[PDB]
Amino acid sequence: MVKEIARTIEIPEGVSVSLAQDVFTATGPKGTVERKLWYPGIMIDVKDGEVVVDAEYARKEQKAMVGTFASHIRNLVKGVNEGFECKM
RNA sequence: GCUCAGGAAUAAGAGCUGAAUGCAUCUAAGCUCGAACUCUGACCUAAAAAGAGACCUCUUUAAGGAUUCCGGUAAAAGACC
């Protein structure tokens, strides 16, 4: 069917996300984390416990970038909520 | 007699994050390391840098500069002390 290039993230409770200027800011029980996710042709909005990210052209580069940004947002919220561990 | 580094950014290469391609992936964005190479740091030269410089002092019929005179740490002539 359709090649729509929109993605939702469904932010969970606790994280105070924002998209001031370009840097994407979050805060929660496990401290705060910051990141910058600016890229032409890829717009991001934060609203109602979810961040919507999409593009305009169906070129595969746009689709790859929208996937990458969605993954980064998920990992940021997940990290600020509880944290991440590595065992060696 | 003296004759070093340290740092920044990199090549081949090794990784992290990561989607197109639900997974996976060093790569497509992004990030971390990485050479006697490159840059910086030492060293020599450089207001005739035409955007032709900055600051201070002394004095504009003076400050000061040259020539003569006695010389050499300098010297082909000039210059320099």
Short mmCIF file of all heavy atoms in Angstrom, two decimals, chain B residues 34-49:
data_model
loop_
_atom_site.label_atom_id
_atom_site.label_comp_id
_atom_site.label_asym_id
_atom_site.label_seq_id
_atom_site.Cartn_x
_atom_site.Cartn_y
_atom_site.Cartn_z
P G B 34 44.61 8.05 20.01
OP1 G B 34 45.69 7.79 21.00
OP2 G B 34 44.26 9.44 19.67
"O5'" G B 34 44.99 7.29 18.66
"C5'" G B 34 45.32 5.91 18.65
"C4'" G B 34 45.48 5.40 17.25
"O4'" G B 34 44.20 5.39 16.57
"C3'" G B 34 46.37 6.23 16.35
"O3'" G B 34 47.74 5.91 16.52
"C2'" G B 34 45.85 5.91 14.95
"O2'" G B 34 46.39 4.69 14.47
"C1'" G B 34 44.36 5.72 15.21
N9 G B 34 43.56 6.92 14.93
C8 G B 34 43.19 7.89 15.83
N7 G B 34 42.46 8.83 15.30
C5 G B 34 42.33 8.46 13.98
C6 G B 34 41.65 9.09 12.92
O6 G B 34 41.00 10.14 12.93
N1 G B 34 41.77 8.38 11.74
C2 G B 34 42.46 7.22 11.59
N2 G B 34 42.45 6.70 10.36
N3 G B 34 43.10 6.61 12.57
C4 G B 34 43.00 7.28 13.73
P A B 35 48.85 7.05 16.70
OP1 A B 35 49.24 7.08 18.12
OP2 A B 35 48.38 8.30 16.06
"O5'" A B 35 50.07 6.49 15.86
"C5'" A B 35 51.11 7.34 15.44
"C4'" A B 35 51.76 6.84 14.18
"O4'" A B 35 50.76 6.56 13.17
"C3'" A B 35 52.70 7.82 13.50
"O3'" A B 35 53.97 7.83 14.11
"C2'" A B 35 52.71 7.33 12.06
"O2'" A B 35 53.60 6.24 11.89
"C1'" A B 35 51.28 6.84 11.89
N9 A B 35 50.41 7.83 11.24
C8 A B 35 49.47 8.64 11.82
N7 A B 35 48.84 9.40 10.97
C5 A B 35 49.39 9.06 9.75
C6 A B 35 49.14 9.49 8.45
N6 A B 35 48.25 10.42 8.14
N1 A B 35 49.86 8.94 7.45
C2 A B 35 50.76 8.01 7.75
N3 A B 35 51.08 7.52 8.94
C4 A B 35 50.35 8.09 9.90
P A B 36 54.38 8.97 15.15
OP1 A B 36 54.74 8.29 16.41
OP2 A B 36 53.39 10.07 15.16
"O5'" A B 36 55.71 9.57 14.51
"C5'" A B 36 55.73 10.00 13.16
"C4'" A B 36 57.14 10.02 12.63
"O4'" A B 36 57.57 8.67 12.36
"C3'" A B 36 57.37 10.75 11.33
"O3'" A B 36 57.48 12.15 11.49
"C2'" A B 36 58.66 10.11 10.82
"O2'" A B 36 59.80 10.74 11.41
"C1'" A B 36 58.56 8.68 11.36
N9 A B 36 58.26 7.68 10.32
C8 A B 36 58.87 6.47 10.21
N7 A B 36 58.45 5.75 9.21
C5 A B 36 57.50 6.54 8.60
C6 A B 36 56.68 6.34 7.48
N6 A B 36 56.69 5.25 6.73
N1 A B 36 55.83 7.32 7.14
C2 A B 36 55.81 8.42 7.88
N3 A B 36 56.52 8.71 8.95
C4 A B 36 57.36 7.73 9.27
P C B 37 56.29 13.16 11.10
OP1 C B 37 56.92 14.43 10.65
OP2 C B 37 55.34 13.20 12.23
"O5'" C B 37 55.56 12.52 9.84
"C5'" C B 37 56.16 12.51 8.55
"C4'" C B 37 55.11 12.62 7.47
"O4'" C B 37 54.08 11.63 7.71
"C3'" C B 37 54.37 13.95 7.43
"O3'" C B 37 55.06 14.94 6.68
"C2'" C B 37 53.04 13.56 6.82
"O2'" C B 37 53.15 13.40 5.42
"C1'" C B 37 52.81 12.19 7.45
N1 C B 37 52.06 12.23 8.73
C2 C B 37 50.79 12.82 8.83
O2 C B 37 50.28 13.35 7.84
N3 C B 37 50.15 12.84 10.01
C4 C B 37 50.70 12.28 11.08
N4 C B 37 50.04 12.31 12.23
C5 C B 37 51.96 11.65 11.02
C6 C B 37 52.59 11.64 9.85
P U B 38 55.19 16.44 7.24
OP1 U B 38 55.85 17.24 6.19
OP2 U B 38 55.79 16.40 8.59
"O5'" U B 38 53.69 16.94 7.40
"C5'" U B 38 52.93 17.36 6.27
"C4'" U B 38 51.58 17.90 6.67
"O4'" U B 38 50.79 16.86 7.31
"C3'" U B 38 51.57 19.04 7.68
"O3'" U B 38 51.87 20.30 7.11
"C2'" U B 38 50.16 18.94 8.25
"O2'" U B 38 49.21 19.50 7.35
"C1'" U B 38 49.95 17.43 8.29
N1 U B 38 50.28 16.85 9.61
C2 U B 38 49.44 17.11 10.67
O2 U B 38 48.46 17.82 10.56
N3 U B 38 49.80 16.54 11.86
C4 U B 38 50.89 15.73 12.08
O4 U B 38 51.11 15.27 13.19
C5 U B 38 51.70 15.50 10.93
C6 U B 38 51.37 16.05 9.77
P C B 39 52.75 21.36 7.93
OP1 C B 39 52.98 22.53 7.05
OP2 C B 39 53.92 20.67 8.51
"O5'" C B 39 51.81 21.83 9.12
"C5'" C B 39 50.70 22.68 8.89
"C4'" C B 39 49.80 22.79 10.09
"O4'" C B 39 49.42 21.47 10.56
"C3'" C B 39 50.39 23.45 11.32
"O3'" C B 39 50.45 24.86 11.25
"C2'" C B 39 49.47 22.94 12.42
"O2'" C B 39 48.23 23.64 12.42
"C1'" C B 39 49.21 21.51 11.95
N1 C B 39 50.12 20.53 12.61
C2 C B 39 49.95 20.28 13.96
O2 C B 39 49.07 20.89 14.57
N3 C B 39 50.76 19.39 14.58
C4 C B 39 51.70 18.76 13.89
N4 C B 39 52.47 17.90 14.53
C5 C B 39 51.89 19.00 12.50
C6 C B 39 51.08 19.88 11.91
P U B 40 51.65 25.65 11.95
OP1 U B 40 51.46 27.09 11.69
OP2 U B 40 52.92 25.01 11.58
"O5'" U B 40 51.43 25.41 13.51
"C5'" U B 40 50.43 26.12 14.22
"C4'" U B 40 50.23 25.55 15.61
"O4'" U B 40 50.15 24.11 15.54
"C3'" U B 40 51.33 25.81 16.62
"O3'" U B 40 51.27 27.10 17.20
"C2'" U B 40 51.12 24.69 17.62
"O2'" U B 40 50.06 25.00 18.50
"C1'" U B 40 50.69 23.54 16.72
N1 U B 40 51.80 22.63 16.35
C2 U B 40 52.36 21.87 17.35
O2 U B 40 52.02 21.95 18.51
N3 U B 40 53.36 21.04 16.96
C4 U B 40 53.84 20.88 15.68
O4 U B 40 54.75 20.08 15.48
C5 U B 40 53.20 21.68 14.70
C6 U B 40 52.22 22.50 15.06
P G B 41 52.61 27.94 17.45
OP1 G B 41 52.22 29.24 18.04
OP2 G B 41 53.43 27.91 16.22
"O5'" G B 41 53.39 27.12 18.57
"C5'" G B 41 52.89 27.01 19.89
"C4'" G B 41 53.61 25.94 20.66
"O4'" G B 41 53.54 24.69 19.94
"C3'" G B 41 55.10 26.17 20.88
"O3'" G B 41 55.34 26.99 22.01
"C2'" G B 41 55.65 24.76 21.03
"O2'" G B 41 55.53 24.29 22.36
"C1'" G B 41 54.71 23.94 20.14
N9 G B 41 55.28 23.61 18.82
C8 G B 41 54.85 24.11 17.62
N7 G B 41 55.50 23.63 16.61
C5 G B 41 56.41 22.77 17.17
C6 G B 41 57.39 21.97 16.54
O6 G B 41 57.64 21.87 15.34
N1 G B 41 58.11 21.24 17.46
C2 G B 41 57.90 21.28 18.81
N2 G B 41 58.71 20.49 19.54
N3 G B 41 56.99 22.02 19.42
C4 G B 41 56.29 22.74 18.53
P A B 42 56.45 28.14 21.97
OP1 A B 42 56.32 28.97 23.19
OP2 A B 42 56.40 28.81 20.65
"O5'" A B 42 57.82 27.34 22.07
"C5'" A B 42 58.91 27.67 21.24
"C4'" A B 42 60.04 26.70 21.37
"O4'" A B 42 59.72 25.48 20.65
"C3'" A B 42 61.35 27.15 20.76
"O3'" A B 42 62.07 28.03 21.60
"C2'" A B 42 62.05 25.84 20.47
"O2'" A B 42 62.64 25.31 21.64
"C1'" A B 42 60.89 24.95 20.06
N9 A B 42 60.71 24.87 18.60
C8 A B 42 61.60 24.30 17.72
N7 A B 42 61.24 24.35 16.47
C5 A B 42 60.01 24.98 16.52
C6 A B 42 59.12 25.33 15.51
N6 A B 42 59.32 25.07 14.22
N1 A B 42 57.99 25.95 15.87
C2 A B 42 57.78 26.21 17.17
N3 A B 42 58.56 25.94 18.21
C4 A B 42 59.67 25.32 17.81
P C B 43 62.38 29.53 21.12
OP1 C B 43 63.18 30.20 22.16
OP2 C B 43 61.12 30.15 20.65
"O5'" C B 43 63.33 29.33 19.87
"C5'" C B 43 64.58 28.68 20.01
"C4'" C B 43 65.16 28.30 18.67
"O4'" C B 43 64.27 27.38 18.00
"C3'" C B 43 65.33 29.43 17.66
"O3'" C B 43 66.47 30.23 17.90
"C2'" C B 43 65.38 28.67 16.35
"O2'" C B 43 66.65 28.07 16.15
"C1'" C B 43 64.35 27.57 16.60
N1 C B 43 63.02 27.95 16.09
C2 C B 43 62.77 27.83 14.73
O2 C B 43 63.67 27.40 14.00
N3 C B 43 61.58 28.17 14.23
C4 C B 43 60.64 28.64 15.04
N4 C B 43 59.47 28.96 14.49
C5 C B 43 60.85 28.79 16.43
C6 C B 43 62.05 28.43 16.91
P C B 44 66.38 31.83 17.82
OP1 C B 44 67.55 32.36 18.55
OP2 C B 44 65.03 32.28 18.21
"O5'" C B 44 66.61 32.14 16.28
"C5'" C B 44 67.84 31.85 15.65
"C4'" C B 44 67.78 32.01 14.15
"O4'" C B 44 66.90 31.02 13.57
"C3'" C B 44 67.22 33.32 13.63
"O3'" C B 44 68.14 34.39 13.68
"C2'" C B 44 66.81 32.96 12.22
"O2'" C B 44 67.93 32.90 11.36
"C1'" C B 44 66.27 31.55 12.43
N1 C B 44 64.81 31.54 12.64
C2 C B 44 63.97 31.69 11.53
O2 C B 44 64.50 31.84 10.42
N3 C B 44 62.64 31.68 11.70
C4 C B 44 62.14 31.53 12.92
N4 C B 44 60.82 31.52 13.05
C5 C B 44 62.96 31.37 14.06
C6 C B 44 64.27 31.38 13.88
P U B 45 67.60 35.90 13.72
OP1 U B 45 68.77 36.80 13.64
OP2 U B 45 66.66 36.04 14.85
"O5'" U B 45 66.77 36.05 12.38
"C5'" U B 45 67.40 36.40 11.16
"C4'" U B 45 66.40 36.59 10.05
"O4'" U B 45 65.49 35.47 10.02
"C3'" U B 45 65.48 37.79 10.17
"O3'" U B 45 66.08 39.01 9.76
"C2'" U B 45 64.30 37.39 9.30
"O2'" U B 45 64.61 37.54 7.92
"C1'" U B 45 64.21 35.90 9.61
N1 U B 45 63.24 35.61 10.68
C2 U B 45 61.92 35.55 10.33
O2 U B 45 61.54 35.76 9.20
N3 U B 45 61.06 35.26 11.34
C4 U B 45 61.39 35.02 12.65
O4 U B 45 60.49 34.77 13.45
C5 U B 45 62.78 35.08 12.94
C6 U B 45 63.64 35.37 11.97
P A B 46 65.56 40.40 10.35
OP1 A B 46 66.27 41.49 9.66
OP2 A B 46 65.59 40.29 11.83
"O5'" A B 46 64.04 40.46 9.90
"C5'" A B 46 63.70 40.70 8.54
"C4'" A B 46 62.20 40.71 8.33
"O4'" A B 46 61.64 39.42 8.69
"C3'" A B 46 61.42 41.69 9.17
"O3'" A B 46 61.46 43.01 8.69
"C2'" A B 46 60.03 41.08 9.16
"O2'" A B 46 59.39 41.31 7.92
"C1'" A B 46 60.37 39.60 9.27
N9 A B 46 60.43 39.16 10.67
C8 A B 46 61.53 39.11 11.48
N7 A B 46 61.29 38.65 12.67
C5 A B 46 59.93 38.39 12.64
C6 A B 46 59.05 37.88 13.61
N6 A B 46 59.42 37.55 14.84
N1 A B 46 57.76 37.74 13.26
C2 A B 46 57.39 38.09 12.03
N3 A B 46 58.12 38.57 11.03
C4 A B 46 59.39 38.70 11.42
P A B 47 61.22 44.24 9.69
OP1 A B 47 62.44 45.07 9.71
OP2 A B 47 60.67 43.74 10.96
"O5'" A B 47 60.07 45.07 8.98
"C5'" A B 47 59.91 46.45 9.26
"C4'" A B 47 58.83 47.07 8.41
"O4'" A B 47 57.57 46.41 8.72
"C3'" A B 47 58.60 48.55 8.66
"O3'" A B 47 58.21 49.20 7.44
"C2'" A B 47 57.45 48.56 9.65
"O2'" A B 47 56.68 49.74 9.65
"C1'" A B 47 56.63 47.36 9.17
N9 A B 47 55.82 46.74 10.23
C8 A B 47 56.25 46.15 11.38
N7 A B 47 55.29 45.70 12.14
C5 A B 47 54.14 46.01 11.43
C6 A B 47 52.79 45.79 11.70
N6 A B 47 52.34 45.18 12.80
N1 A B 47 51.89 46.21 10.79
C2 A B 47 52.33 46.82 9.69
N3 A B 47 53.58 47.08 9.33
C4 A B 47 54.45 46.64 10.25
P A B 48 59.31 49.66 6.36
OP1 A B 48 60.64 49.17 6.78
OP2 A B 48 59.12 51.11 6.11
"O5'" A B 48 58.90 48.89 5.04
"C5'" A B 48 57.56 48.47 4.82
"C4'" A B 48 57.43 47.61 3.60
"O4'" A B 48 57.52 48.44 2.42
"C3'" A B 48 58.51 46.54 3.46
"O3'" A B 48 57.97 45.37 2.83
"C2'" A B 48 59.53 47.22 2.56
"O2'" A B 48 60.34 46.33 1.82
"C1'" A B 48 58.65 48.07 1.65
N9 A B 48 59.27 49.32 1.17
C8 A B 48 60.44 49.96 1.48
N7 A B 48 60.64 51.08 0.83
C5 A B 48 59.51 51.17 0.04
C6 A B 48 59.09 52.12 -0.89
N6 A B 48 59.78 53.20 -1.21
N1 A B 48 57.90 51.90 -1.50
C2 A B 48 57.21 50.81 -1.17
N3 A B 48 57.50 49.85 -0.32
C4 A B 48 58.67 50.11 0.25
P A B 49 57.65 44.04 3.68
OP1 A B 49 57.84 44.31 5.12
OP2 A B 49 58.39 42.92 3.06
"O5'" A B 49 56.10 43.79 3.45
"C5'" A B 49 55.17 44.84 3.66
"C4'" A B 49 53.75 44.36 3.78
"O4'" A B 49 53.65 43.46 4.91
"C3'" A B 49 52.73 45.47 4.04
"O3'" A B 49 51.48 45.15 3.44
"C2'" A B 49 52.60 45.45 5.56
"O2'" A B 49 51.38 45.98 6.04
"C1'" A B 49 52.71 43.96 5.84
N9 A B 49 53.18 43.62 7.19
C8 A B 49 54.47 43.51 7.63
N7 A B 49 54.57 43.15 8.89
C5 A B 49 53.25 43.01 9.28
C6 A B 49 52.67 42.65 10.50
N6 A B 49 53.37 42.36 11.58
N1 A B 49 51.33 42.59 10.57
C2 A B 49 50.62 42.89 9.48
N3 A B 49 51.06 43.24 8.28
C4 A B 49 52.39 43.28 8.25
#
